[PDB]
Structure 1
Amino acid sequence: MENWSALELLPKVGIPTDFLTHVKTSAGEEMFEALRIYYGDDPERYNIH
């Protein structure tokens, strides 16, 4: 339920990533919580209330 508009909109510090397995496997098998896996481009980040 986290503010994903706050993730997509705010400036983000870049990193060299390293997942051990493939990242889509880690998303589909829940290494973490609240995994926003939208495909394409969802424009729902644009409207601000």
Structure 2
Amino acid sequence: MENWSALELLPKVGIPTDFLTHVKTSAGEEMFEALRIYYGDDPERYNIH
């Protein structure tokens, strides 16, 4: 399974994103093959092992 914490830590490229519809609508209507959504602040990325 995809490890989202690695994406969360590693440097990223700044992009102007363009979803035609609302992001939560495209995600809820299952546009993307794999998806992770969390609210607030998730401590998962901090426990490097």
Please confirm whether the aligned pair reaches a TM-score higher than 0.5, indicating the same fold.
yes
CA shift at 1:22, angstroms? 0.4
**Which residues of structure 2 form unaligned runs of 5+?**
none
The residue matched to 1:15 in structure 2 has which SS? coil
CA shift at 1:44, angstroms? 0.6
Which structure dedicates a bigger proportion of its chain to strand? Answer: 1
Write out the 4+ residue segments of structure 1 that deviate beyond 4 Å after TM superposition.
none
Instruction: Count residues in correspondence.
Output: 49
TM-score (normalised: structure 2) = 0.90
Identity %, equivalent residues: 100
CA–CA distance in 1 between the matches of 2:26 and 2:40? 19
TM-score (normalised: structure 1) = 0.90
CA–CA distance in 2 between the matches of 1:43 and 1:34? 21
Which moved further from structure 2: 5-14 or 25-34? 25-34
CA shift at 1:48, angstroms? 1.1
Deviations 1:1-33 (A, max 9, x none): 201011100000001110010000011111112
